Amino acid sequence: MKVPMLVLDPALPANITLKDLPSLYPSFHSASDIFNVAKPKNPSTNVSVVVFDSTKDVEDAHSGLLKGNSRQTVWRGYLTTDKEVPGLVLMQDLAFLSGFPPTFKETNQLKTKLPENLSSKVKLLQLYSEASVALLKLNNPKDFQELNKQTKKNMTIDGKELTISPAYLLWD
């Protein structure tokens, strides 16, 4: 699998939303979501990440910065579900979820019915409206590393258990 995102090396401050994004980021105007994060290997630097509809707006959005210089950086990133890429590595703040029932066709629904172990220092920002797979963002990978290899009953919705799926990081 793989999904169209861009990765950059900014720092937006805490105050900016989707509505103050295009204030300084004209070619990134087409997103519907944005999240502040650490850099994966330098916690002395914040960065941020974005979500776009498809390749069709992404390719052009990236093409924004192509005038030999910028105040910004762009890199590649492609999340996948498959353990079928050479060079793959586990994530550092990011996951999926599976196994929930079809009674779940909105984010707001599951937002407050995910179980404690996967509803502690985390958020949804990527669920299918019609298909049955979700992504996740976490903030405490300290314990995610332990959850990732847990071995007991803890998740339930409508009396039916679930699990979490793996996630891996691919740059180009």
Question: Which letter, b or e, does each residue of 122-158 get, where b requires 16 or more Cβ atoms within 10 Å of its Cβ?
Answer: bebebbeeeeeebbbbbeebeebeebeeeeeeebebe
| Alpha helices (runs of H) in the chain, residue ranges in sequence order | 55-63, 107-111, 141-147
The verdict on 40 and 16 lying in the same domain is yes
Amino acid at 2: K
Is the sign of the CA dihedral 70, 72, 76, 79 positive or negative? negative
The verdict on 96 and 63 lying in the same domain is no
The verdict on 90 and 159 lying in the same domain is yes
| Owner of token pair 């720092």 | 11
Query: What span, in angstroms and rounded, lies between the C-alpha atoms of 135 and 167?
Result: 9
The verdict on 34 and 77 lying in the same domain is yes
The verdict on 64 and 114 lying in the same domain is no
DSSP string, 130-158: SSS-EEEEES-HHHHHHHTT--S----BT
The verdict on 62 and 145 lying in the same domain is no
> Do the beta carbons of residue 37 and residue 47 sit within 8 Å?
yes
> Do the beta carbons of residue 169 and residue 77 sit within 8 Å?
yes
Query: What span, in angstroms and rounded, lies between the C-alpha atoms of 71 and 93?
Result: 26
The verdict on 33 and 60 lying in the same domain is yes
Query: What span, in angstroms and rounded, lies between the C-alpha atoms of 11 and 14?
Result: 9
- Please identify, among 28, 54, 82, the residue that sits at the C-terminal boundary of a domain: 82
The verdict on 21 and 43 lying in the same domain is yes
For 23, the token pair is: 């204030």
Domain count of the chain? 2
- Please identify, among 82, 116, 136, the residue that sits at the C-terminal boundary of a domain: 82
The verdict on 70 and 142 lying in the same domain is no
The range of the structural domain enclosing residue 72 comes to 1-82
Nearest to 91 by CA among 152, 135, 133, 134: 135
The verdict on 16 and 88 lying in the same domain is no
- Please identify, among 29, 52, 82, the residue that sits at the C-terminal boundary of a domain: 82
Residue 59 in 3-state DSSP?
helix
The verdict on 91 and 154 lying in the same domain is yes
Residue 62 in 3-state DSSP?
helix
Query: What span, in angstroms and rounded, lies between the C-alpha atoms of 130 and 158?
Result: 19
The verdict on 117 and 62 lying in the same domain is no
